[PDB]
Amino acid sequence: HRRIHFVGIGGAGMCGIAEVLLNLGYEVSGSDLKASAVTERLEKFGAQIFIGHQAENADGADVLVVSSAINRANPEVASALERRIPVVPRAEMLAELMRYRHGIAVAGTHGKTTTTSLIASVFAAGGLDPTFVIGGRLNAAGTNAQLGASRYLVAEADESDASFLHLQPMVAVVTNIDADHMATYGGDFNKLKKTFVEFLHNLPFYGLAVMCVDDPVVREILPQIARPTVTYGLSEDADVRAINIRQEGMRTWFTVLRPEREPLDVSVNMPGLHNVLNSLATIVIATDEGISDEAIVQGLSGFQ
Numbered sequence: 145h146r147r148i149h150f151v152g153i154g155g156a157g158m159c160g161i162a163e164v165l166l167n168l169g170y171e172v173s174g175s176d177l178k179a180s181a182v183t184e185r186l187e188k189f190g191a192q193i194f195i196g197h198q199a200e201n202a203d204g205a206d207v208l209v210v211s212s213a214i215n216r217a218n219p220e221v222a223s224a225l226e227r228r229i230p231v232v233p234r235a236e237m238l239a240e241l242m243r244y245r246h247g248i249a250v251a252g253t254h255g256k257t258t259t260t261s262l263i264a265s266v267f268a269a270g271g272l273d274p275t276f277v278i279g280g281r282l283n284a285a286g287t288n289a290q291l292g293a294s295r296y297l298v299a300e301a302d303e304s305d306a307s308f309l310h311l312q313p314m315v316a317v318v319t320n321i322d323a324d325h326m327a328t329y330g331g332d333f334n335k336l337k338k339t340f341v342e343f344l345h346n347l348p349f350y351g352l353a354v355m356c357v358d359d360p361v362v363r364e365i366l367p368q369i370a371r372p373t374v375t376y377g378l379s380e381d382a383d384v385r386a387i388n389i390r391q392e393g394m395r396t397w398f399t400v401l402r403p404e405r406e407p408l409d410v411s412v413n414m415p416g417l418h419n420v421l422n423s424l425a426t427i428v429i430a431t432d433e434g435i436s437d438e439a440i441v442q443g444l445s446g447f448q
């Protein structure tokens with residue numbers, strides 16, 4: 145399959161996905177109700193854009209991406225269903241981008257968004273210009289460069305998303321495991337916890353699990369993770385720990401302890417121990433990746 149067609153390519157987090165797919169070398173087409181600077185950019189990058197929804201826009205497509213669900217009203221979808229051209233939801237195509245890059249999946253009920261951004265900020269300080277996914281929207285700092293150009297793809301992993309178990313990351317963080325989304329799993333918290341174990345088992349044997357052992361549920365499932373694991377937290381028995389936490393204004397300072405490394409003084413421009421924990425998770429990923437102490441310090445502190 146070589147040509148991907150987006151129904152409503154302008155809106156949502158549709159445009160970012162199309163942009164990455166162009167970067168990967170696919171033929172990309174899309175329809176939308178109104179032309180915009182978003183569709184002009186996609187067209188400049190090689191996408192074929194149709195204004196209006198007629199069945200002939202899906203011609204030649206090997207797969208359709210829709211933003212919400214399959215709508216019989218929209219004729220492109222119905223013309224695809226009738227040719228058995230698969231129609232996949234936006235979120236699933238978004239998840240699969242990770243198979244083409246060195247993916248870093250940030251899971252956890254709370255803190256996914258700040259941790260993803262901290263990671264992207266540090267990697268960017270290290271010259272790596274990652275593409276990152278927050279709220280289903282693809283971003284990077286390069287602006288002129290196509291999304292997906294970096295080797296690195298940093299993405300929120302939401303345990304209530306239907307594609308949660310279809311991510312193929314190289315690195316996975318679990319900041320914490322809460323019962324918010326029990327209804328997704330029959331309303332059973334034990335089922336929810338098993339899904340996080342399953343999610344971590346999507347790592348390859350050479351992958352990394354980054355686990356916040358300050359959360360008692362993360363700590364409970366730790367012995368089931370049969371994947372390389374680095375723990376972090378304020379707990380005294382974490383691999384990567386924060387000590388001597390202090391303040392200077394809205395800036396939080398602390399010293400991070402790492403195995404086989406000297407103590408490193410960092411600071412982050414956001415308050416509360418949760419942003420200390422977000423920094424530790426970032427520090428673990430950057431360290432394993434070989435990023436320098438200078439870029440870790442610069443990425444964490446210059447983060448607004």
Ligand SMILES: OC[C@H]1CCCCN1c1nc(Nc2cc(C3CC3)[nH]n2)c2c[nH]nc2n1
Nearest residue numbers: 254255258319320356359418419421422425
């Ligand atoms: O159960 C401990 C959890 C439960 C509730 C939030 C505090 N806790 C936490 N948070 C993190 N990050 C966050 C959280 C938020 C906003 C929601 C406040 N922004 N960033 C974490 C990164 N690693 N570990 C974490 N723990």
